[PDB]
Structure 1
Amino acid sequence: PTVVGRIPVLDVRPVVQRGRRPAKAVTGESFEVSATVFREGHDAVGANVVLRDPRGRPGPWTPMRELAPGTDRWGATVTAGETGTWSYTVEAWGDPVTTWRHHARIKIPAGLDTDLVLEEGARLYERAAADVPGREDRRELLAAVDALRDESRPAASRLAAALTPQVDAVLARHPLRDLVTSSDPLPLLVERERALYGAWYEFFPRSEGTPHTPHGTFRTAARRLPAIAAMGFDVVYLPPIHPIGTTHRKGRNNTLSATGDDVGVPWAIGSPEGGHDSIHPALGTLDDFDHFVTEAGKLGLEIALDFALQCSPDHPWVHKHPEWFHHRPDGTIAHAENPPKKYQDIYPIAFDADPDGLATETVRILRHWMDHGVRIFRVDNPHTKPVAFWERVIADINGTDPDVIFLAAAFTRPAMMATLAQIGFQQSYTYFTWRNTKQELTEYLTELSGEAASYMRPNFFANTPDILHAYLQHGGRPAFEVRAVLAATLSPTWGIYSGYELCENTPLREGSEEYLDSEKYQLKPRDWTRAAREGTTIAPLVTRLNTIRRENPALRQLRDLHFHPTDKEEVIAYSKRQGSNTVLVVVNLDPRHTQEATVSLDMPQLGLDWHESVPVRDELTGETYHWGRANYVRLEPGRTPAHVCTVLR
């Protein structure tokens, strides 16, 4: 057997780890399948993509086209349907009809061997007819055969009868394919829509209490859910909801010693009251948690829980499973580190004494929360547990419950980030918060929407409890507005951490990305009613962005994204498309100064002629403009962060 087939079809993409891991999609998502296809000699080739579903049923006829002249790189768009494990193949073939037409278009006018050329055509069309299933299609081709062979008609008329649009249609649907050659199947894992598309809101339930009981419960925190749904969110991410240790508990502002009433850090999980399968007693009971999940569900909100595989020193595991920790010669366990950050309140887990016990217990815990309606987990610090451990855990959970979504909070180096996505994490956090200039955004999004999209689905959190970027610190409310527009329009999944709406931007100190008086170490009551009354919240802009996303299918996908040039360093422009829906976005990245620029649209990329002019509506204001190849924009921080425009038809 030869590696290469009769008609070479090589290096089919997407591919992940050389075919050993699936490429990714979600239901309704379109992506490009490509390949290198060519043949020996000068005759034409064709190619097509056969996408097969979980029961092996092939999809529709999907012909490919050469993507750029001279490259022999071919492509076509496919669309994923129902969830499960799919496969895709590229078929390549000699295209004798195209070859014959090209010869005939030249030889018939020149008068060179014309009876012979037309007779060659007739025999091809005869072979074409025989392979066609439809009876009226077959009759069309046989009529062209007889016209080709009618030696009483002039040569140019006999030929023209084989080149009608009615004949082209039969052959475009059922072409004559010589020497059909297949690639080996590549795997595709199709997951639910929420894995790619959704808006996320993070808050601490304990902060939403009362004057008489400052520490919030699930019952009091449920009152926040209606406002979260009104801002157009789909997922509520809760920090750890378990008991919190007392030994080495941290105080306010990440000080080493907790005082009397200090609540500690939710990530320091475990006490005598319970571990990862228990509820913090100040939050309420498991029953109260069910009522919270039920109320969320009625508002169209899914709950995502933090899963943080680590322990306070008071966690039951410390004595029940000592072999799950690394001990030093004196018996002590070294607290976790991520230098120069120290985590004196927690122990990390060791994996090499009892890997089986840890995996068994991990999937038991996840299944417990799954039984109470949690179908999404934000996995804290996945990059400090072994990569193969997560691969096992995710395969075990998704083997019985393929709807469960895991989000990797992998704030680490690129290779680990990529690997975690490739071994099965449905979503990843990204370097988004550290991409603020036009060049940084353009480069990074070109990476995320290109090759990485076959294995990674990004979740653009504009802030997190650990990340208040200098851009927001120095820019104030106009910077919050810019980052919300960017996050919501550049990824189909974005999110914010509570307080973002209020433009909370006071850092711990200069050159830090921590918040002053961080919610991680203290209760943080906020006057939501007052901020709404006084207009000192950007909640309306957040709400409008989420409504724009819900109404424009182009913003519910990742891969179709193009950047259009402007003549100002501070102004960035881009478009996204999905069927007949086109969204065009222009953002002023300067939060202090007004910017005027000329935006020069690559018009072919919008499906339009260079000289054309199209109406657009800015969905932030309701204003209509008329934009063509070159358009003046004026963007004033505080009044207009950006234009977010739909192309009107």
Structure 2
Amino acid sequence: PTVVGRIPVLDVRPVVQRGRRPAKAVTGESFEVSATVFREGHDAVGANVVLRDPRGRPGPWTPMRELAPGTDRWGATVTAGETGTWSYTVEAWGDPVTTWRHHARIKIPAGLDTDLVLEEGARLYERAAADVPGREDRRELLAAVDALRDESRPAASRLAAALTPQVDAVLARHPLRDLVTSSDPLPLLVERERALYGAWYEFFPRSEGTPHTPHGTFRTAARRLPAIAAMGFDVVYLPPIHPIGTTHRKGRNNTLSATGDDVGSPWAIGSPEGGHDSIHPALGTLDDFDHFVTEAGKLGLEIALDFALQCSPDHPWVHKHPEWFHHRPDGTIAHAENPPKKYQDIYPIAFDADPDGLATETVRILRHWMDHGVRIFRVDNPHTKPVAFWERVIADINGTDPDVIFLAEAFTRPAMMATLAQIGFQQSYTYFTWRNTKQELTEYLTELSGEAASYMRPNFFANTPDILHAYLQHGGRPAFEVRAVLAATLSPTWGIYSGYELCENTPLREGSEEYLDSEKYQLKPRDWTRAAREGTTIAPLVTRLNTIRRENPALRQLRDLHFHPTDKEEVIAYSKRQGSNTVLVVVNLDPRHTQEATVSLDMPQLGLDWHESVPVRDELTGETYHWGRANYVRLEPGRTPAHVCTVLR
């Protein structure tokens, strides 16, 4: 038994961990299946992709083409349908009809062995007709056969009868395939739309309180939900909603000792009041939570809860399950770290004394919140827990509830980030916030939209409670507008942390990416009404970007992305396409100076000829333009961060 088949079909992609983990897609998402296909001798090959659904049913006829001359690399686009575990194969084959046509087209005008050549053509078309199911199609081919054999017609006429468009149509759909050879099937995990596409909004319920009761509840925080939905978001992500420890509770601005009314960090989970399956008593009850979830649902918002597998020193687990922690010789548990950051208010979990107990309890907790309508979890720092632990937990949860989405908050080295996605995380945080120059952005998104897209779905948060980039610090509102445009148009999933709209950008100190008076350690009431009235919010820009995304399919996918040359380092241009929808974006990365540039569009990449010019509408302003191979732009920060254009019919 040979490893290589009759007609070699090798190195089928996409592939994850040599086939041990599935490649990823979502419903309706297109992606390219490719392979290395060739044969011995000089005759032609063909190839096609067979995508099988969870019941094993093959999809449509999907012929491949060679992707570049001389490479023997073949590819075709396939589209994922319903959710579940799919599989795909590549089939390679001798293509004798293409070979014969190429030869016949030369030998017949030349008068070389024309009777022999034409009879050879007849015998091929006969064999082709054998595997054709439709009688009318069979007759079309038999007609070509009989004309090929009609020795009373001129040679050129006999040949032309075999090359009609009606003949071609039958053969494109039902080619004569010699020596059909398959690859072994590769697995494909198809998940719901929201795993790839969605806009995310993060906020702290406790900050949305009242004059008499500053600490918000689920009842009072539910009042933010309409504004969040009105901005076009689809997911609300909440920091931990559990009780917060008192022992070593942190004070305002990440100081070591809390005083008086200090609320502590939500990530210091657990107290006598309860742990990960409990509600912070100042937020209300489980019933209040259900109400909040119902109200979010009515507005088209899904809740994403923070899952942080760690404990305050006051968490029940500390005495109920001591072996879930590493104890030093004197009995103490060292507080967690993420150097040079220190987390004195929490203990990390130890996994090697009782991995089964931890896993059982972890999925019990997740299933608790799932029963209260939470189908998305934002997983805090998963790279500090064992990789195989997440693999097991996610397979367990998705085994009964495949719609549950896990988002990996792993800001770490590339190997770990990729692995966490590959072992099951539906979504990943990225390096987005640390990619701000044109080169950084171009390089990173080429990586994300390239091969990584077969296992990773990026969630572009333009800020988070722990990340205020110096770009925003130094650039002010024009920088906030640029990052929102970039995040919203470069990834099918993006997000902001509340306060981004107001352009909050005062850091803890120079050189830090922490906010001053961080909301992690104090209530932060914000005057939303005033900001709206005084126009000191970019909420209208955020709203518009999400509307443009909702209306343009090209912006709801990841893999089709192309960067176009510009003659200015500060100006970046790119396009994305999905079917007949084409979006073209031009961004001035300079938040402080006006930039004019020439944008030289890669026209064949837009599916246009170099001479052509197309109508475009800038969806940020309503202005229309006619663009071609080279277009002038002038972008004034404060007035215009970018052009976000749809190509018009």
TM-score range, shorter chain: over 0.9
Return the alpha-carbon distance in structure 2 between the equivalents of residues 341 and 542 of structure 1.
32
Structure-2 separation of matches of 1:112 and 1:420:
63
Measure how far apart 1:560 and its partner are.
Answer: 0.2
Deviations 1:261-289 (A, max 9, x none): 00000000000000000000000000000
| Aligned-partner SS, 1:109 | coil
Per-residue CA deviation, residues 66-90 of structure 1 (Å, 9 max, x unaligned), is 0000000000000000000000000
CA distance in 2 between counterparts of 1:20 and 1:415 reads: 17
CA-CA distance at 1:315 after TM superposition: 0.3
- C-alpha displacement of 1:541: 0.2
- Map 1:372-521; keep pairs closer than 5 Å: 372-521=372-521
Return the offset for 1:571.
0.3
Give the Cα–Cα distance (whole angstroms) in 2 for the partners of residues 37 and 593 of structure 1: 52
Question: Which residue does the alignment assign to 2:526?
Answer: 526
Residue by residue over 1:338-394, the C-alpha shift from the partner in whole angstroms, topping out at 9 and shown as x without a partner, is 111110000000000000000000000000000000000000010000000000000
Shift of 1:583: 0.2
1:519-538 deviation line (CA, Å, top 9, x unaligned): 00000000000000000000
Q: Secondary structure at the match of 1:345?
A: coil
Q: 2:292 & 2:554 partners in 1: Cα distance?
A: 33
**Matches of 2:212 and 2:602, distance apart in 1:** 61
Distance 2:504 2:132 in 1: 67
Q: Secondary structure of 2:109's match?
A: helix
Structure 2: distance between partners of 1:352 and 1:239: 28
CA distance in structure 2 between the partners assigned to 1:138 and 1:338 by the alignment: 70
Instruction: Report the Cα offset of residue 122 of structure 1.
Output: 0.3
The C-alpha deviation readout for 1:559-607, integer Å capped at 9, x for no partner, is 0000000000000000000000000000000000000000000000011
- Residues 599-632 of structure 1 show CA distances to partners (whole Å, capped at 9, x for unaligned) of 0000000111110010000000000000000000
- Output the CA distance in 1 between the equivalents of 2:166 and 2:141: 10
Q: SS in structure 1 opposite 2:446?
A: helix
Give the match's secondary structure for 2:592: coil
Aligned to 1:191: 191
d(CA) in 1 for partners of 2:579, 2:381: 38
Name the SS for the 1:369 alignment partner.
helix
Distance 1:544 1:56 in 2: 42
2:146 equivalent in structure 1: 146
Q: Secondary structure at the match of 1:11?
A: strand
Match of 1:42 in 2: 42
Distance 2:139 2:411 in 1: 64
Matched residues in 2 for 1:383 and 1:153: separation? 75
Describe the superposition over 1:535-558 as per-residue Cα deviations: whole angstroms up to 9, x where unpaired: 000000000000000000000000
Q: Which 4+ residue blocks in structure 1 deviate beyond 3 angstroms?
A: none
- Give, in whole Å, the separation in 2 of the partners of 1:399 and 1:340: 38
Structure 1-normalised TM-score? 1.00
SS at match of 2:389: helix
CA-to-partner distance for each residue in 1:405-463, whole Å, 9 max, x for gaps?
A: 00000011100000000000000000000000000000000000000000000000000
Q: Deviations over 1:198-257 (max 9, x none)?
A: 000000000000000000000000000000000000000000000000000000000000
Deviation for aligned residue 1:648: 0.3
Equivalent residue number for residue 317 of structure 2: 317
1: CA distance between counterparts of 2:63 and 2:388?
Answer: 39
Q: CA–CA distance in 2 between the matches of 1:328 and 1:96?
A: 74
Distance in 1 (CA, whole Å) between partners of 2:468 and 2:105 is 66
* Alignment partners' CA distance in 2, 1:602 and 1:354: 57
Q: CA deviation digits over 1:111-151, x for unaligned, max 9? A: 11000000000000000111100000000000000100011
Could you tell me which runs of 5 or more consecutive residues in structure 2 were left unpaired when the two chains were aligned.
none
State the alpha-carbon separation in 1 of the partners of residues 348 and 422 from structure 2: 24
Per the alignment, residue 619 of structure 1 pairs with 619
**What is the deviation of 1:638?**
0.3
For residue 365 of structure 1, give the secondary structure of its aligned residue in structure 2. Answer: helix
CA distance in 2, matches of 1:140, 1:455: 45
Structure 2 SS opposite 1:258:
coil
How far is the alpha carbon of 1:154 from its aligned partner? 0.6
CA distance in 2, matches of 1:447, 1:594: 29
Q: Distance in 2 between matches of 1:155 and 1:311?
A: 86
TM-score (structure 2 length as normaliser): 1.00
CA distance, structure 1, for counterparts of residue 288 and residue 325 of structure 2: 33
d(CA) in 2 for partners of 1:343 and 1:11? Answer: 46
Distance 1:342 1:128 in 2: 72
Q: Secondary structure at the match of 1:587?
A: strand
Counterpart-to-counterpart distance in 2, 1:151 and 1:318:
94
Note the C-alpha offset of 1:105: 0.5
Structure 2 counterpart SS, 1:465: coil
C-alpha deviations, 1:160-204, integer Å up to 9, x for none? Answer: 000001100000000000000000000000000000000000000
Alpha-carbon distance in 2 for matches of 1:124, 1:161: 14
Give me the whole-angstrom Cα distance separating, in 1, the residues matched to 2:155 and 2:410: 69
Aligned to 1:15: 15
Q: CA deviation at 1:403?
A: 0.3
Aligned partner of residue 115 in structure 2, secondary structure: helix
1-side partners of 2:112 and 2:306: how far apart? 76
- CA distance in 2: counterparts of 1:129 and 1:339, whole angstroms: 70
* Equivalent residue runs for 1:212-611 within 5 Å: 212-611=212-611
User: What is the SS of the residue equivalent to 2:241?
Assistant: coil
Q: Distance in 2 between matches of 1:426 and 1:635?
A: 37
What is the alpha-carbon distance in structure 2 between the residues aligned to residue 340 and residue 40 of structure 1?
60
CA distance in 2: counterparts of 1:131 and 1:253, whole angstroms: 75
Structure 1, unaligned runs of 5 or more: none
CA deviations on 1:294-317 (whole Å, 9 max, x unpaired) are 000000000000000000000000
**Aligned-partner Cα distance in 2 for 1:356–1:614:** 61
Show CA shifts across 1:308-340 (max 9, x none).
Answer: 000000000000000000000000000001111
The CA deviation at 1:29 is: 0.2
Question: SS where residue 137 of structure 1 aligns?
Answer: helix
CA distance in structure 1 between the partners assigned to 2:382 and 2:126 by the alignment = 62
Question: Structure 1: how far apart are the matches of 2:86 and 2:94?
Answer: 27
**CA distance in structure 1 between the aligned counterparts of 2:571 and 2:15, rounded to whole angstroms:** 35
Q: SS in structure 2 opposite 1:617? A: strand
CA distance in 2 between partners of 1:166 and 1:316 (Å): 76
3-state DSSP of counterpart to 1:297: helix
C-alpha deviation, 1:503, in angstroms: 0.3
Partner secondary structure for residue 108 of structure 2: helix
| Pairing 1:77–2:100 present | no
Output the CA distance in 2 between the equivalents of 1:320 and 1:155: 91
- Secondary structure (helix, strand or coil) at the match of 1:633 reads strand
* Counterpart-to-counterpart distance in 1, 2:472 and 2:192: 33
Give the whole-Å Cα distance in 2 for the aligned partners of 1:392 and 1:148: 63
Distance in 1, matches of 2:529 and 2:129, equals 73
Give secondary structure in 2 for the equivalent of 1:474: helix
Secondary structure of 1:406 counterpart: strand
Partner Cα separation in structure 2 for residue 293 and residue 622 of structure 1: 36
C-alpha distance in 1, partners of 2:481/2:298? Answer: 29
CA distance in 2, matches of 1:483, 1:341: 26
